[PDB]
Scaffold this active site. Structure first.
Site, PDB file in Angstrom:
ATOM      1  N   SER A  13      31.848  38.704  46.900  1.00 28.06           N
ATOM      2  CA  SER A  13      32.313  37.390  47.350  1.00 28.06           C
ATOM      3  C   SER A  13      32.121  36.301  46.292  1.00 28.06           C
ATOM      4  CB  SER A  13      31.566  36.983  48.619  1.00 28.06           C
ATOM      5  N   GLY A  14      33.027  35.331  46.297  1.00 27.11           N
ATOM      6  CA  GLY A  14      32.952  34.158  45.439  1.00 27.11           C
ATOM      7  C   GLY A  14      32.512  32.967  46.261  1.00 27.11           C
ATOM      8  N   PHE A  16      33.042  30.754  49.068  1.00 29.96           N
ATOM      9  CA  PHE A  16      33.708  30.706  50.380  1.00 29.96           C
ATOM     10  C   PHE A  16      34.817  31.775  50.630  1.00 29.96           C
ATOM     11  N   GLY A  17      34.385  32.962  51.052  1.00 31.08           N
ATOM     12  CA  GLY A  17      35.228  34.085  51.450  1.00 31.08           C
ATOM     13  C   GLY A  17      34.936  35.397  50.747  1.00 31.08           C
ATOM     14  N   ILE A  19      36.131  39.037  48.802  1.00 30.17           N
ATOM     15  CA  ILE A  19      37.131  39.487  47.824  1.00 30.17           C
ATOM     16  C   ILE A  19      37.249  40.999  47.914  1.00 30.17           C
ATOM     17  CG2 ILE A  19      37.819  39.619  45.351  1.00 30.17           C
ATOM     18  CD1 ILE A  19      36.114  36.916  45.104  1.00 30.17           C
ATOM     19  N   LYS A  34      41.510  37.496  48.051  1.00 27.21           N
ATOM     20  CA  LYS A  34      40.421  36.690  48.612  1.00 27.21           C
ATOM     21  C   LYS A  34      40.852  36.215  49.999  1.00 27.21           C
ATOM     22  CE  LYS A  34      36.982  33.205  47.484  1.00 27.21           C
ATOM     23  NZ  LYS A  34      36.592  32.170  46.499  1.00 27.21           N
ATOM     24  N   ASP A 124      29.648  26.155  37.990  1.00 28.78           N
ATOM     25  CA  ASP A 124      28.951  27.376  38.347  1.00 28.78           C
ATOM     26  C   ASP A 124      29.114  28.416  37.241  1.00 28.78           C
ATOM     27  OD1 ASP A 124      27.086  28.937  39.614  1.00 28.78           O
ATOM     28  OD2 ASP A 124      28.431  29.536  41.227  1.00 28.78           O
TER      29      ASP A 124
HETATM   30  C1  LIG Z   1      39.086  46.829  38.692  1.00 29.85           C
HETATM   31  C2  LIG Z   1      37.603  46.572  38.788  1.00 29.85           C
HETATM   32  C3  LIG Z   1      37.009  47.276  40.018  1.00 29.85           C
HETATM   33  C4  LIG Z   1      36.890  47.035  37.538  1.00 29.85           C
HETATM   34  N1  LIG Z   1      37.428  45.107  38.807  1.00 29.85           N
HETATM   35  C5  LIG Z   1      36.277  44.472  39.171  1.00 29.85           C
HETATM   36  O1  LIG Z   1      35.204  44.996  39.283  1.00 29.85           O
HETATM   37  N2  LIG Z   1      36.355  43.071  39.406  1.00 29.85           N
HETATM   38  C6  LIG Z   1      35.208  42.169  39.215  1.00 29.85           C
HETATM   39  C7  LIG Z   1      35.100  41.130  40.336  1.00 29.85           C
HETATM   40  N3  LIG Z   1      36.442  40.555  40.517  1.00 29.85           N
HETATM   41  N4  LIG Z   1      36.623  39.385  41.135  1.00 29.85           N
HETATM   42  C8  LIG Z   1      37.974  39.143  41.146  1.00 29.85           C
HETATM   43  C9  LIG Z   1      38.455  37.958  41.823  1.00 29.85           C
HETATM   44  C10 LIG Z   1      37.820  36.727  41.625  1.00 29.85           C
HETATM   45  C11 LIG Z   1      38.238  35.590  42.306  1.00 29.85           C
HETATM   46  C12 LIG Z   1      39.300  35.709  43.205  1.00 29.85           C
HETATM   47  F1  LIG Z   1      39.695  34.675  43.912  1.00 29.85           F
HETATM   48  C13 LIG Z   1      39.942  36.924  43.388  1.00 29.85           C
HETATM   49 CL1  LIG Z   1      41.238  37.028  44.513  1.00 29.85          CL
HETATM   50  C14 LIG Z   1      39.541  38.055  42.704  1.00 29.85           C
HETATM   51  C15 LIG Z   1      38.632  40.219  40.502  1.00 29.85           C
HETATM   52  C16 LIG Z   1      40.042  40.481  40.206  1.00 29.85           C
HETATM   53  N5  LIG Z   1      40.919  39.422  40.124  1.00 29.85           N
HETATM   54  O2  LIG Z   1      40.451  41.631  39.948  1.00 29.85           O
HETATM   55  C17 LIG Z   1      37.617  41.106  40.117  1.00 29.85           C
HETATM   56  C18 LIG Z   1      37.668  42.416  39.432  1.00 29.85           C
END
Ligand SMILES: CC(C)(C)NC(=O)N1CCn2nc(-c3ccc(F)c(Cl)c3)c(C(N)=O)c2C1
Ligand SMILES: CC(C)(C)NC(=O)N1CCn2nc(-c3ccc(F)c(Cl)c3)c(C(N)=O)c2C1
Lengths: 290, 288
Positions: A13-14, A16-17, A19, A34, A124
């Site tokens: 989670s980030g 508020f909500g 993921i 998200k 942050d």
């Molecule tokens: C594909 C693997 C599993 C390696 N990716 C991750 O571990 N993640 C880290 C954690 N993480 N967090 C996000 C993320 C951050 C903030 C957001 F609002 C949304 Cl919708 C997604 C995203 C993303 N956009 O793919 C990721 C991606």
């Protein structure tokens, strides 16, 4: 959500909500999604999506594919990105080489400068809020999470927000600036001071104000603040290149409304990189994993 | 799959299949794990068939990792949903246009496997996956676990005719000769594809949902129902090309080389006559 997106594994989670990893079946793309409860008391996912859209085109700014409403949720679909720097630090046994720290530092300073150029402060800055890209974007550091971001100046006049006191610590206490612990309104200098602690955390494996026991959040933040204030920069950075202490002292010397010298800060680490004789190949510690 | 390079994610499915991340290459992948002490090891054998097929249209790229702890590991490039998954997402109904677009690629995928001297022997919707991203219009074939060489690579000598063979594969899509214990050959892969196409058209096949006292008896009831349902009855109310396709496959001798272009032309001509456009917009591309 709907008939188009299949929700996969929750990837934490980030601000508020929750993921999730997901699949856009119609577009044939793996994405991240998200979810914010549509009836939440303080809706912000659409506000956050408009910050990402305003920042669009900036190096290392993630693309938002869709932001709307489905069932009981407000939904924001982001392009799929790679692991965070905290994840990669864990995969690298909580030790980064000086070369990987310097490669990350250059990009992290640039991402923060870009956000500042768009009239916002992030508020942050932490390893979890920087993600590497995947595939052809595997050498690119992205910045995420605008949930705590605030405009620090009027986009038209560039009039800076006023100095304020007795502010609550929003953000992660581990990486907060000293002025943030002291309740001062955050400004550009604070994002950069937080990055200085992130860099030293990558060097050390932990910061000296980590692991302090407390019964409440309020108590923990006081203990962290006291340790952080009472640790001189030259003690914190003992046994590491002087550039890490110079960087932190520069950030701590900035006035509330001062414009940081981002190029001076990048040059500290670029000069050190050159003196160390490292290759400019973007080969990070995790690229050597077998 | 671990080591220090691959992080295992969600289980999606000879062993379990997981989504995963190649941390070093910065790529999301899929990883298959086979217990190192399994009675019937087949992962390494399967990996060599994928490697031999490499470069062919719709053949997934793999990486055999060998033994990592208690498992044999195979990493594959990340692909999209199977055709069975997409059929479910589409409420178990595909338009004629989507069936014809899929048919052309599925015939060619089977022809490619045959050109590489193997028969697949488990042609079913779950063994065809769409690609992701720029490969979203491409149908891939997977699973060489039951695949067998049917001819010599150099001389093209065909394997001999044999009887009393066990039904390996999915009974729903097996050829009639497979139910009758006859050695499978090229014709059988194509007859199975004919049933997959009619399954996509109908939503179900008339030999689905048969109750029985045992699996052995259920396979006998499926065999009886397939043999007792004329092709013209099975395909009633659908373009004649589906019946022509099935009749052709059922008419092949054991060692005959199928006329793959004749079969693709039946559906290519039908697509043109129907006035469809090659925009590659499948039913699932319309989901909201
Ligand atoms: C594909 C693997 C599993 C390696 N990716 C991750 O571990 N993640 C880290 C954690 N993480 N967090 C996000 C993320 C951050 C903030 C957001 F609002 C949304 Cl919708 C997604 C995203 C993303 N956009 O793919 C990721 C991606
Ligand atoms: C990304 C989403 C979750 C939509 N993908 C799937 O649902 N899948 C269908 C089921 N499925 N099966 C595989 C697969 C088949 C056979 C294998 F040996 C390996 Cl390692 C992976 C793979 C693959 N290579 O990505 C897939 C992919």
């Amino acid at each position: 959500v709907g008939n188009r997106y299949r929700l996969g594994r929750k990837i934490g989670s980030g601000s508020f909500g929750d993921i999730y990893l997901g699949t856009d079946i119609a577009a044939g793309e793996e994405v991240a999604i998200k979810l914010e409860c549509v009836k939440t008391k303080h809706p912000q996912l659409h506000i956050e999506s408009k910050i990402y859209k305003m920042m669009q085109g900036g190096v290392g700014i993630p693309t938002i594919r869709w932001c709307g409403a489905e069932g009981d949720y407000n939904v924001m679909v982001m392009e799929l990105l790679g692991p965070s720097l905290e994840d990669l630090f864990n995969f690298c046994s909580r030790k980064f080489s000086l070369k990987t720290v310097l490669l990350l530092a250059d990009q992290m300073i640039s991402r923060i400068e870009y956000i500042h150029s768009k009239n916002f402060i992030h508020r942050d800055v932490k390893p979890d809020n920087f993600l590497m890209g995947l595939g052809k974007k595997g050498n690119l550091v992205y910045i995420i999470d605008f949930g705590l971001a605030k405009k620090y100046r009027d986009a038209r006049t560039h009039q800076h927000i006023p100095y304020r006191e007795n502010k609550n610590l929003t953000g992660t206490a581990r990486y907060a600036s000293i002025n943030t612990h002291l309740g001062i309104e955050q400004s550009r200098r604070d994002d950069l001071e937080s990055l200085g602690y992130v860099l030293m955390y990558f060097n050390l494996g932990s910061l000296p104000w980590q692991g302090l026991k407390a019964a409440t959040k309020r108590q923990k933040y006081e203990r962290i603040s006291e340790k952080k204030m009472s640790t001189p920069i030259e003690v914190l950075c003992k046994g590491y290149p002087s550039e890490f202490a110079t960087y932190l002292n520069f950030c701590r010397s900035l006035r509330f409304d001062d414009k940081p010298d981002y190029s001076y800060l990048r040059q500290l680490f670029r000069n050190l990189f050159h003196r160390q004789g490292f290759s400019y190949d973007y080969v990070f510690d995790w690229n050597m994993l077998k």
